[PDB]
Design an enzyme around this catalytic site. Sequence first.
Site, PDB file in Angstrom:
ATOM      1  CB  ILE A  42      -0.963   0.014   1.201  1.00  0.00           C
ATOM      2  CG1 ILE A  42      -2.145   0.944   0.927  1.00  0.00           C
ATOM      3  CG2 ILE A  42      -0.239   0.439   2.465  1.00  0.00           C
ATOM      4  CD1 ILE A  42      -3.363   0.657   1.767  1.00  0.00           C
ATOM      5  CG  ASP A  43       4.230   1.137   2.289  1.00  0.00           C
ATOM      6  OD1 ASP A  43       3.958   0.121   1.615  1.00  0.00           O
ATOM      7  OD2 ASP A  43       4.975   1.107   3.291  1.00  0.00           O
ATOM      8  N   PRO A  44       3.822   3.315  -1.594  1.00  0.00           N
ATOM      9  CG  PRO A  44       2.653   4.195  -3.375  1.00  0.00           C
ATOM     10  CD  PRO A  44       2.660   4.165  -1.886  1.00  0.00           C
ATOM     11  CE1 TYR A  45       9.404   0.781   0.349  1.00  0.00           C
ATOM     12  CE2 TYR A  45      10.291   0.653  -1.869  1.00  0.00           C
ATOM     13  CZ  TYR A  45      10.021   0.064  -0.653  1.00  0.00           C
ATOM     14  OH  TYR A  45      10.364  -1.247  -0.434  1.00  0.00           O
TER      15      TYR A  45
END
Lengths: 350, 993, 209
Positions: C60-63
């Site tokens: 869910i987290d693209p950094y």
Amino acid sequence: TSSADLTNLKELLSLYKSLRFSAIEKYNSLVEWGTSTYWKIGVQKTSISDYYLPVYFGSVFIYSKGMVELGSGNSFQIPDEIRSACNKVLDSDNGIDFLRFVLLNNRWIMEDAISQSPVNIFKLASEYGLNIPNYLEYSIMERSFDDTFPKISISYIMYIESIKVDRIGDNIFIPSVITKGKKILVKDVDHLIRSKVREHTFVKVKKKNTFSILGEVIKRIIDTIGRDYYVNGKYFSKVGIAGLKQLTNKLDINECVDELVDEINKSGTVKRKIKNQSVFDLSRECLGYPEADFITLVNNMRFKIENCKVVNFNIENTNCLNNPSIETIYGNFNQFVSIFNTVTDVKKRL
Amino acid sequence: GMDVRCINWFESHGENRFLYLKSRCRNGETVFIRFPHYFYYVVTDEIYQSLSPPPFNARPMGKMRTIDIDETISYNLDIKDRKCSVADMWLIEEPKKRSIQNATMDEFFNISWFYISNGISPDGCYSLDEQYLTKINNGCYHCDDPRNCFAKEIPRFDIPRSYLFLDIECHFDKKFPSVFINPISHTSYCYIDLSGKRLLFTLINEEMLTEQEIQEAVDRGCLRIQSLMEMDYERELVLCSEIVLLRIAKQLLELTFDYVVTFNGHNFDLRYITNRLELLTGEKIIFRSPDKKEAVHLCIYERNQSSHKNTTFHVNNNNGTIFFDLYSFIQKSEKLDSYKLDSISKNAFSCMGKVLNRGVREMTFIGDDTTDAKGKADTFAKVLTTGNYVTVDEDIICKVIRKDILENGFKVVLSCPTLPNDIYKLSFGKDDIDLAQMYKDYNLNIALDMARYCIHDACLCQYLWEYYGVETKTDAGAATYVLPQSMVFEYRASTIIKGPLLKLLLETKTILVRSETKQKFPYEGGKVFAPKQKMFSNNVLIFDYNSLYPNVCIFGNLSPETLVGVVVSTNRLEEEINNQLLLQKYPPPRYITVHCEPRLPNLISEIAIFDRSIEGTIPRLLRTFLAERARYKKMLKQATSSTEKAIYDSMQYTYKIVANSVYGLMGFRNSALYSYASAKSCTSIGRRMILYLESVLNGAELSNGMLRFANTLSNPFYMDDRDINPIVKTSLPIDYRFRFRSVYGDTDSVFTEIDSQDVDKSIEIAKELERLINSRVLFNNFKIEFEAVYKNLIMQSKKKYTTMKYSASSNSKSVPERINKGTSETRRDVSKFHKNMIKTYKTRLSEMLSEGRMNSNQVCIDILRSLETDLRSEFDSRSSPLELFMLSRMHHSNYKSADNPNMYLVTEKNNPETIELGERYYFAYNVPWTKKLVNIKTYETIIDRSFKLGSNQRIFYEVYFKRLTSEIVNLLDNKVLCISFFQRMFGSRPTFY
Amino acid sequence: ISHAPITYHDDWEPVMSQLVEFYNEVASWLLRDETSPIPDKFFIQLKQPLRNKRVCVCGIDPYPKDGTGVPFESPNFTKKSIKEIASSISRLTGVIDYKGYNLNIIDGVIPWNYYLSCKLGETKSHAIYWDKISKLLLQHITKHVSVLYCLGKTDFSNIRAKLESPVTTIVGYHPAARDHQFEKDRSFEIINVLLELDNKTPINWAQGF
DNA sequence: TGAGATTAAGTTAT
DNA sequence: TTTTTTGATAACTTAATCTCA
Ligand SMILES: [Ca+2]
Ligand SMILES: [Ca+2]
Ligand SMILES: [Ca+2]
């Protein structure tokens, strides 16, 4: 998710492949757990795998988990836990599959097994000494090798005259028919049941090296073969009226009221066997009554048991009387109730 | 903060976790309290004494007793006693999650632990002591221990609650409105601040109106504010801009409102407002924490609940506001097809009106206590205060030309076309308004009309809130379930019992550790009894048990800790012996033995033994629930103020709900009250009770003045202390000669047919039979009650039947109601021109068979004459009523290619308008006199739900006629013309089971 | 496409037609504001068929600002999430070749991103910009996959709603966790045996580096 | 030449 | 940027299945 789920999935995979040798009942519940946690799995909720040494003629069974038959779902008990007494060849030595045991006249024999290589199977057979199929690593090759039991083949890597039943063990009588002066291998009653052969009639039977082999019919069989010779499974059995003699023979104890109790108390293993199984089951095993027929006969009856003792049994449904085996068994039900009463009294005293 | 009443409970999901408390003082100020929050573990002294950290905080919980609850088959009488361990488990709090080895007293999340460890009713008022309270911020008083700070509790007081009943009207161009392309138009608020100052706002976005329209509105007495600070709260219409409107909405939402209420709001309204606000202005609704430490940046989260054999949107604010949605709550209570705003308003707001004056179009009506019973007239006037469309005779809707509420009713002047008669049904049904066309050409007059509609929508959300008693419902849920007010309508029966169960366990000091692989057997057996015949035409008396399943659960003490063993047998040579052993070793009135159906196929008998010595968790939990419902339903009979519905009206409803699911939880596999043997015993004893009731009234003769029961009156389980005399001493008039035949019985209901036909004799007979049954037939806590007299009973199927309901009060001349229990009338599967025809035919057959002829067959001829008048003529489509052809069919989820295999159901296209899984759907599927049968389910899909249809079509017709004929031929017996009914049209023969 | 001008592939054929319509509603506003990934990590993982990547991993987290598109692809090893995954893999197997662990270069594994684009330091905030596109995008992956690797725990709790078809999927704890509750027990090899349950060859996570 | 027995599931009601 | 989910069944209803061909 966790280690428990990983172990559960690994064992699910392990039992999925080895399903034809049964575990299968628990396998459905294994699919139920998989269909919920992962919302679906790759699998959905009694014969040898094809695969494939002379055939030891008799009743063949296969076991790999820790004994189902390839022909049908025939998984019966074993004497004195022979399977566990032989440890586990499957787990101890990986490579062998569905170890095969053949019973011949109440004697358990092991035939050829499929691995790996047969060398390790032969070494395991030598280590745990029960019997050997042969040493190959129908009147040639196998004819040279001699043994006390008939053998025909897996691989190498007439006219009858009269009827005469034989005798093997305690209240056990294998079927036998005399041809124009040899005994036809008809020890399996079902093959005789499924194909009734009239006496003094030509029958399509073929002999390889030593011997030859191929409700209304059941009535003819029960009438011709000694009248009082019921079916106790794969073989026949007489009424065998007896008292404490059968109890002593089955328990492998000295023949003996208090003497029997003292003899039971002396041997710890027999005492554990007595106080480790139900009275009904051990009595049925002692008299050798088939499990399927006797359960139906008991269910179709109206016993008046009081103080754990049958007083006056009677029959209610006549339909179960159609089978000749139940008719003969119901005839000797007095012996069963007397032995059951004696066993109950002995266990109460103990 | 001296005496303050709690409004909401919540906690902060920050680096340091604090459990807060929002409260209102007797004044109009919000007081926040803050406490530290920890994870709770009740491990023993031998698992936490040996660990890296010492006990951070421990409590003297006391010597706890743990009983291992398990079920095991036993082919014998040798059952080992249950192992109970008494120890010194300590109540331990740790500010961080630790994986302890013991892990006892699980399946409690975090919050009930706090509420019971300290002691707080989540709804109530407390005297917050100033000794501990510290002014950690502006108005936030944080203190350490929440244990002695709530030492004394006081009765609650009517705080000045603040409400934001908000509803927004958007631009429905052609599809469902979206936050990305559809602008907001008509946000309306029923702002109720903390002064009793109701303020109705209908703020129009000014980007759609022109200069002339806004100038004319200002001349009429409206505003054109350009900033948030210059808005006046006392006005009634504003003409603001989009960005300013969003800023006003953000300012209102960020306020410490007690409640923010919407209809389809969390899914649509509040989400629309939010997403639009961040999309246009860039501002975010920052709900500051009570101590001003955590910003949440408001976002509504979706919660999914699904059964192996439902999505709800919720708010995430942590400032104490209780943001609420009415759609989800409405699709949770009872069972009805009214799941739409207009439909619910039509089903809820109705009255009777007398035409006191006619005219060319103006037909003046009157509503008061004279026409209707009471209350509905006042509610009608309240809705009419802003409502401007009233539906009459279920098919005529007229705009209210003139309205006037004098003191207790209304003077609505409709546009009826000189309707006949004198009395009509005045209801707030749907409106003839075409929203898409209204927005298509937007002018000042239409803008004002839409403002009226949107303010009526907001006030209608308020009226639905008042009618359902949602605030009462939320308070009752908080009080009953021991839960925060924000979580009362999103927890199923499995978790809502955990709170009261935890309180009961901590009062009883029992952990009840459950070992793995307890039970896995599929279910328990059941039975359904067919009726005697399909035609009665006489009075039939209905008797009903009083919550039979909880009553048997408390009767048998069916709890896993009280389960002794399940003795099972595989043959009859051992079944007799072990049965005698069970009978002689377990005395009856301390161990109940239930002959449940065998759990395994190779077993013939299974007896489950329950120890009725110490009360179990289930028999005490449901006992508490029943006592609470009984105590909280008598207050509405005593309370005369608004509290009668404001407080003491939903407690009993919630307690009834929780008691009515204990049995269902008792058989649910992964539940805190799972007990397979208990479910088996409960079902078996219920079936025994229905059999006992049925075969005591099957052939009872009311000779002279006494009733002779069919069989003997004996306890169907063991030797009770009741007489076995089947004759009674009832006090009916001595000139009575009737015969009772037990016809049908459902789980807790029994029907007995009588020879009499008049209502009054049946009512008196049934009442005295009911008063005699509980005294003689039933025993212990099993009570029965007489439901109603069901004359003209027609058992349409095994369970479906149609009757003429007559309660203990409605005598003879009283107008009857056709209350049924699953026939065509009650079931939603039926459609238009289907219930009226069968109603008429059954009513005719009533007097056709009451006198008794056994040969009259004119009913079929009359039915043919009635049907042939319109059967051929209906074949023209002529704009058929799509609005009442379909059924409770929702967008189903379980399917292979299409649920109920058809063209495009589930899979479907253009269905934007209120189409989703769980929504009741209405739709419709030159060749008159259709030939043959073509499996008529052709066009069944999920497309745009409208209320209009085409014309000049000769489409085939559905199961209406065939089912009418099938029911009729089920009523009659002769099949002389059975084939000819549809051989020409379809071709078939009725089953006539 | 009207915003940010597809080259559709045969594999993702029944998706793009509705995907462009779903995107156009948000692209008028999301594209204007800056985002952590470069405005290119939208359709790069669309080329070539998906007929052999039977294991798909989603995050869910693209950094943060140093984004890479597909999850766990930064060739720096400084990422907390990548480092813990590589440590777990080394603990399970014991490979010494360290050049940057990534779950993308596999003959039978494709990486996927739950939210294609997110703003700088704004996680869980884009629950409305990509909500509609995500369901349709995950539908095609659900249509043909052996197992889906979801990491985030309660972050990925709402996945059955976007699951149009019943498939095998696992939701695991994210590496951040609360008390480092990821190295204690992850049970990665379950997926390694899950392919075996579906009569498919197991995948050893060391192919290519 | 119409008469039946599970599916294929739902489908409403205590 | 962190703890969380749900009651079992018994049955009438329409469904073509298809072939006697
Ligand atoms: Ca609305
Ligand atoms: Ca609305
Ligand atoms: Ca009841």
